[PDB]
Amino acid sequence: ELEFTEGIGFDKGFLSAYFVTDFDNQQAVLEDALILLHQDKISSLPDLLPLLEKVAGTGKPLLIVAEDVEGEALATLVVNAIRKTLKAVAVKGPYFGDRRKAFLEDLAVVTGGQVVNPDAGMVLREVGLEVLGSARRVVVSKDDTVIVDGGGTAEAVANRAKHLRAEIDKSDSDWDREKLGERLAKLAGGVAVI
């Protein structure tokens, strides 16, 4: 079809009500935000602090999409979001297994960021603003997240789309093909135009 819903979204909402910016619509709204995509779970504050201090210094709000966010890391995130010293929201990644990791890569592609993957050998404590994606607008609801106009490049998006189409033609499972198809549809609507 030619119709599509603006931005890229998934059925995962905020991890804490303390991140809510508008209780009328029960959602957290971020404008011109920075986006951290983390493969694993974020819990250690020391490991996350260095990047958070950098982000806090930028004045832009932050969306965090990880396997899960908890412990002392979630706490300082909540606290600083309340004080507004760092307007942020933490959300959990949508799917599971390879599909889960593949979707974070999709998000990184459309937002122009880089997935932080400790399993690959990366270390959060040493990453800078370069690993962060960007989006003109982010809206996190109780059970869903939508990202509008990501900062990804034309070639990264085009290549990812070509990659998904190839996966669709080499798939011998209708169930699988359909999942790939929905990722392709979402991908397209997440990037910024003009």
Side-chain angles (χ1 to χ4, degrees), residues 82-156:
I82 296 177
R83 303 198 294 200
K84 207 84 178 303
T85 44
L86 172 47
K87 185 185 181 176
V89 180
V91 169
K92 194 145 64 182
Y95 314 116
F96 82 86
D98 293 315
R99 259 255 289 191
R100 186 181 73 79
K101 306 171 183 55
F103 191 68
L104 286 184
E105 300 177 337
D106 287 354
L107 286 184
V109 169
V110 301
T111 60
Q114 189 190 314
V115 177
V116 178
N117 184 8
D119 270 357
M122 300 178 72
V123 15
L124 186 54
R125 170 176 289 114
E126 63 175 55
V127 301
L129 292 169
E130 71 285 345
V131 89
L132 299 172
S134 67
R136 186 177 65 67
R137 178 196 181 71
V138 181
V139 173
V140 181
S141 296
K142 184 172 188 172
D143 50 60
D144 76 86
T145 294
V146 174
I147 298 168
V148 180
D149 299 317
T153 69
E155 180 165 7

Side-chain angles (χ1 to χ4, degrees), residues 43-65:
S43 177
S44 167
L45 176 60
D47 200 44
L48 177 68
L49 196 57
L51 179 63
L52 285 191
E53 303 185 312
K54 293 193 177 187
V55 172
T58 69
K60 319 186 75 153
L62 173 71
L63 165 73
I64 295 180
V65 183

